[PDB]
Amino acid sequence: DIFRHILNFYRTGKLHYPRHECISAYDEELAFFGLIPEIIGDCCYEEYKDRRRENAERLQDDADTDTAGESARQRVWRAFENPHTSTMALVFYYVTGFFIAVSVIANVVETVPCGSSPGHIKELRYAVAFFCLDTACVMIFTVEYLLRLAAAPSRYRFVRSVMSIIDVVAILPYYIGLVMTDNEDVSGAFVTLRVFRVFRIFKFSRHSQGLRILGYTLKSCASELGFLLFSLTMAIIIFATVMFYAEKGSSASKFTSIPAAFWYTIVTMTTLGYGDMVPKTIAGKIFGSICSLSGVLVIALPVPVIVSNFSRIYHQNQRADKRRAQKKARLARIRAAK
Amino acid sequence: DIFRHILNFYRTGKLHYPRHECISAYDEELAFFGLIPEIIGDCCYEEYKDRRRENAERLQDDADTDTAGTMTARQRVWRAFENPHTSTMALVFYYVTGFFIAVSVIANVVETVPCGSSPGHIKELRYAVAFFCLDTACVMIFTVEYLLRLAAAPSRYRFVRSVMSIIDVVAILPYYIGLVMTDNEDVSGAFVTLRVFRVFRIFKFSRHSQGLRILGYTLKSCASELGFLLFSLTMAIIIFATVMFYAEKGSSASKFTSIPAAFWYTIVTMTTLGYGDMVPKTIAGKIFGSICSLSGVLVIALPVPVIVSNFSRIYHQNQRADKRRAQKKARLARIRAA
Amino acid sequence: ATVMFYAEKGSSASKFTSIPAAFWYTIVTMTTLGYGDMVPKTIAGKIFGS
Amino acid sequence: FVTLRVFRVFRIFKFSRHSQGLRILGYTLKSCASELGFLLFSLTMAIIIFATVMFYAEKGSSASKFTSIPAAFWYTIVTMTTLGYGDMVPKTIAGKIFGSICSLSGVLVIALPVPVIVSNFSRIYHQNQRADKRRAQKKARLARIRAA
Amino acid sequence: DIFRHILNFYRTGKLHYPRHECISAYDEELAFFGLIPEIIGDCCYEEYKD
């Protein structure tokens, strides 16, 4: 059947690719017959290249099936980074997740009125022991990183990873607070450091598969996110300027300056509508409605490609385990079926 | 045609499956030639695999023949009213109990308006407790069906294990618990809680609906997606609430008392609801509220298309199944007609 | 609406006078409209509103 | 003078040179003129109908803000877009029912042409990317066919 | 090409419908050859009807 295509090619000087003969059957024939794969039509060339690519993404994951087969601090590192190895890795995974959960819930509770300054002014409870808990969690986290400091086959390669930078930036706040307390006490960046303290949630990227795939999707669609941001800035600037210039004349209009118009426009384009700032002139109302419509449009512009990329990556990642299992079953079955 | 692929297999160590021809003839040829089916390439292998599970999916329900022609036993009339179209008694029972459920729910909703069950007259003569009687008039009837369901239950254990049965139990129980409590004198508190389940009584409508069962099926299938939705939503709530609260602790009349208030603000902002009860005041607060709104749009819209697609495909496959069952019955009728 | 009324009928001057008011609030919430006329004030109210 | 100052932000569209998304959006808006016109027509029809129903059901109240039909236009356009500022709100039972149905109908009307616009933009972007990628791949094909 | 499908049908007792031969070419052949259009497979019957 492919020889017929070669005959047609020699007849006309241009070759075409059968659609129902696939590529791993076409490639073998074109290699055996010695044909040139860069003269196969124009439209057929493109569709053949696309199909070659489509069948090409599955030649490396099956190659990556073996993963790591090396054993020893390397062996314990392999058991650690992949929890589904032994009881030890499961124990550390579970306990680390539990302690991250207790740290974040403690940070949440830190300002609960029963657990904070209010609720007791007439007589005095405000247990400061929260502090100690934080300390414990922090050092435990550092112990984690300490093994990551040693078990990593390459120090620089591990540090370059985003997981390492997240871990270290969540480690810093406790030590920075200790250093600040060591040298007197000044108001200011202490609340800011407490703000950075919340970033400890991100360790669940290890205790999940959805967080890392979501990060993958966001990193892949960076151009579309930038287009979102640019178009949104254009729209907010235009609509805020128009509404300010059509509403600055009023009794006590909340549109004091352009940034107030930014606030109103960004709460409108997102269809939020707090009601703090509303127009009072006809031009104000009409441009507010147009702004809401344009905000719906702008926000809905890139979400289809975002959700499509997320879905595609999720299908491939979730089916990785499935076709791995069925290849394993086929491999077990084949050598006894001959 | 298939002999060509067979000869291609005997040419090398690999075989390929064309995408157009049906799988049935191909597996028939594989069986007749004595060829193993786990040797048909790798890409073509998985393509054949998905085609074969697709064609087995349309074949598993093809055996819907046991539902053919109060004639055999008690279980026979049980199955007769299980399908509310077999007999006149089944349909009348189904629709009449649907009307009873509807009137029960109407009584439940109307028992609080200040014209029929609350004093709209401080000194005049209505607050009829007849709803109770009506309620009892419903409750007894309700219990009836459950006993009827247990009158001819083919498997008591499996039927009790069913979600439909436990829904029925949770629907009928609260009145029994309330009357037992009244038999053991009246205490304020959980009485409103027992009254709440009077609207969980609604799920009896799942019999009188096809969409509800499909929604339950797709929610059961998409448990992982819902769990990831919950996890990512909680993470976003915590992060944005902490950032908002720590940036709004001090103001003239700040409503951000503590972290739970920031949870309320973050969940009314990400859902694009925007009640306006608590609003940001500082520039950092406004910026972080805006980014919270956009991120909430993203997070909410991440799993919703997945849920929607799963529901749509389940509905479509159900419709395809019933339509092809009807068409195969018609095919049998016309093949016996000539 | 029933859940929010039974979790919010106890308040100082709660606008949830009767179940139809809870219908109004619920239908302005499920549509993500949020006029702000009626808002919960108890923890159960807030969680069930979300 | 303020009107002349306004166009200082219409000056922004000079960024269309420094952007590919803006040109694609312009192309798809030009292609989908009929869809946008039907959007406008159906939206105006819904505005008129729901505003009339709301206003005629809310003329008389203690402190009703529905002074006239344009106020009902404002309410209908803040309700259909699921914005809900809260400046003017229904008070009567018929008013609440019609506000609810207005909100649902506005969701429907807004979501009718938006997927069409989105699909047209996506297909235009995809065909542009396919065109430039295949131009690059045919240049590479020429380079390798001259290499041997 | 459709005669080959008829041959396979007589070989096995069950007929299948080619996917690239369309229907207004399949219908004429099945009418000229007098085949029964209600024995053409099970999955193939459904896809042919669609």
* Surface of A (263-292) touching C: CB under 8 A: 271, 273, 275
Largest separation between any pair of C-alpha atoms in chain B: 101
Distance from CA of B56 to the nearest CA of C (A): 41
Residue positions counted in chain D: 148
Amino acid (1-letter code) at residue E10: Y
Q: Which of B270, B285, B282 is nearest to B235 (CA)?
A: B270
Burial of B196 (0-12, 13-18, 19+ CB in 10 A): middle
| CB-nearest partner of D87 from A271, A278, A304 | A278
Which tokens sit at D47? 């505005």
Could you give the CA distance from residue B166 to residue B158 in angstroms, rounded to a whole number?
11
Residue C2 near residue B196 (C-beta atoms within 8 A) = yes
Residue ranges of the annotated binding site of B for Zn(2+) are: 16, 22, 43-44
Minimal CA–CA distance to B274: which of A272, D81, C39, A267?
A: A272
Give the residue ranges of the annotated binding site of C for K(+). Answer: 32-35
* Contact: chain D with chain E (3+ CB pairs below 8 Å): no
- CB of B276 less than 8 A from some CB of D: yes
Question: Phi-psi category of B276—alpha, beta or left, where left has phi over 0 and alpha has psi -120 to 50?
Answer: left
Taking alpha carbons only, the member of B271, B288, B268, B272 closest to residue B280 is: B288
Chain B residues touching C35 at Cβ < 8 A? 275
Please give the Cα distance from A100 to A52 (Å, whole number): 45
Q: Which of E11, E8, E16 is nearest to E39 (CA)?
A: E16
DSSP state letters, B47-61: HHHHHHHHHHHHHHG
Yes or no: say if B44 and A22 are a contact pair by the CB < 8 Å rule: yes
Q: Which amino acid is at B224?
A: S
Chain center to CA of E21: 10
**Cα–Cα distance for residue pair A87/C7, rounded to 1 Å:** 46
Report CB contact under 8 Å: D82, B272: yes
Q: How far is D94 from chain C (nearest CA, A)?
A: 11
User: Who contacts D5 (Cβ-Cβ below 8 Å, separation ≥6)?
Assistant: A245
CB-CB neighbours of B138 under 10 Å: 22
The residue behind tokens 């006329």 is C37
Q: Say how far apart CA B233 and CA B246 lie, in whole Å.
A: 20
DSSP letters along D54-81, please? HHHTSSSSSS----SHHHHHHHHHHHHT
Question: Among candidates A279, A304, A265, A26, which has minimal Cα distance to B18?
Answer: A26
Per the annotation, does A274 bind a ligand?
yes
C31–D86: do the CB atoms touch at under 8 Å? no
Taking the C-alpha atoms of residue D9 and residue A217, their distance in angstroms, rounded to an integer, is: 34
Interface B:D, Cβ pairs < 8 A:
3
Whole-angstrom distance, CA of residue D57 vs CA of residue D98: 9
Q: Positive or negative, the Cα torsion across A28, A33, A34, A40?
A: negative
Tokens of A212: 């890392």
List of chain A residues whose C-beta atoms are within 8 Å of the C-beta of residue D86:
273, 275
Interatomic CA distance for residues A58 and A23, integer angstroms: 13
Residue among E46, E35, E47, E27 nearest E9 (CA): E35
Q: Can you tell me the distance from the alpha carbon of D131 to that of D125, in angstroms, rounded to the nearest whole number?
A: 10
| Strand extents, DSSP E, chain E | none
Around Cβ A108, how many Cβ atoms within 10 Å?
19
Q: Three-class SS string for chain A? A: CHHHHHHHHHHHCCCCCCCCCCCCCHHHHHHHCCCCCCCCCCHHHHHHHHHHHHHHCCCCCCCHHHCCCCCCHHHHHHHHHCCCCCHHHHHHHHHHHHHHHHHHHHHHHCCCCCCCCCCCCCCCCCCCCHHHHHHHHHHHHHHHHHHHHHHCCCHHHHHHCHHHHHHHHHHHHHHHHHHHHHCCCCCCHHHHHHHHHHHHHHHHHCCCCHHHHHHHHHHHCHHHHHHHHHHHHHHHHHHHHHHHHHHCCCCCCCCCCHHHHHHHHHHHHCCCCCCCCCCCCHHHHHHHHHHHHHHHHHHHCCHHHHHHHHHHHHHHHHHHHHHHHHHHHHHHHHCCCC
Instruction: Please report, to the nearest 10 degrees, the dihedral formed by the alpha carbons of residues A310, A273, D2, A256 taken in order.
Output: -110
For residue A163, give both structure tokens. 């997981």
Q: Is A43 annotated as a binding residue?
A: yes
Measured distance CA(B81)–CA(B99) in Å, rounded: 17
- A158, two tokens: 């591990």
Q: How far is D93 from chain B (nearest CA, A)?
A: 14
**DSSP code of residue B115:** T
| Calpha distance B208→A295 (Å, rounded) | 41
| A vs B: CB pairs below 8 A | 119
CA distance A230 to chain C (A): 27
Alpha carbon B72 to chain centroid, angstroms: 34
| C-alpha distance from B324 to closest chain D C-alpha (Å) | 32
Residue found under tokens 């896809």: E47
Instruction: B111-117: list long-range contacts, CB under 8 Å, 24+ apart.
Output: B112/C5, B112/C18, B112/C19, B113/C18, B113/C19, B113/C20, B114/C17, B114/C18
Planar angle of CA B194, B199, B205, nearest 5 degrees = 135
Does A96 show up as a binding residue in the annotation? no
Whole-number Å distance between alpha carbons of A114 and E27: 81
Burial (CB count <10 Å: 0-12, 13-18, 19+), residue B333: exposed
Cα–Cα distance measured from residue A173 to residue A193, given in angstroms and rounded to the nearest whole number? 6
Neighbours of A55 (CB within 10 A): 17
Task: Find, among A62, A46, A318, the residue nearest to B43 by Cα.
Answer: A62
> Who among E36, E44, E49 is closest to B327 (CB)?
E49
Measured between beta carbons, which residues in chain B are less than 8 angstroms from residue E46? 58, 324, 327
**H and E: helices and strands count for chain B:** 14, 0
Which of D38-47's residues contact partners 24+ apart within 8 Å by CB, and which partners? Answer: D38/D113, D39/D109, D39/D112, D39/D113, D42/D109, D42/D112, D43/D80, D43/D109, D43/D110, D46/D76, D46/D80, D46/D102, D46/D105, D46/D106, D46/D109, D47/D73, D47/D76, D47/D77, D47/D80
Which residues in chain A precede a discontinuity of more than 2.5 Å between C and N? 71, 124
Contacts of C6 in chain B (CB under 8 A): 192-193, 195-196
What experiment produced this structure?
Answer: cryo-EM
CB contact at 8 A, B132 and B108:
no
Q: Output DSSP code: residue B293.
A: H
Helix (H) or strand (E) holding C25: helix C19-30
A/B touch flag: 3 or more CB pairs below 8 Å: yes
Lookup result for tokens 């207790």: A102
Residues of B in contact with D78 (CB under 8 A): none
Q: φ, ψ for residue A17 (rounded to 5)? A: -105, 120
With left for phi above 0 and alpha for psi between -120 and 50, is residue D103 left, alpha or beta?
Answer: alpha
Angstrom distance (rounded) from CA A176 to CA A164: 18
* Class of residue B91 by CB neighbours under 10 A (exposed 0-12, middle 13-18, buried 19+): middle
**Which residue from B34, B50, B32, B39 is spatially nearest to B8, judged by alpha carbons?**
B39
Helix, coil or strand: residue B111: coil
- d(C-alpha A103, C-alpha A100), whole Å: 5
Output the six-digit token pair for A103: 């740290």
Contact partners, residue B222, CB within 8 Å, separation at least 6: B303, B306, B307, B310
Tokens (6 digits) for A216: 């993958």
Residue with tokens 């920031």: B262
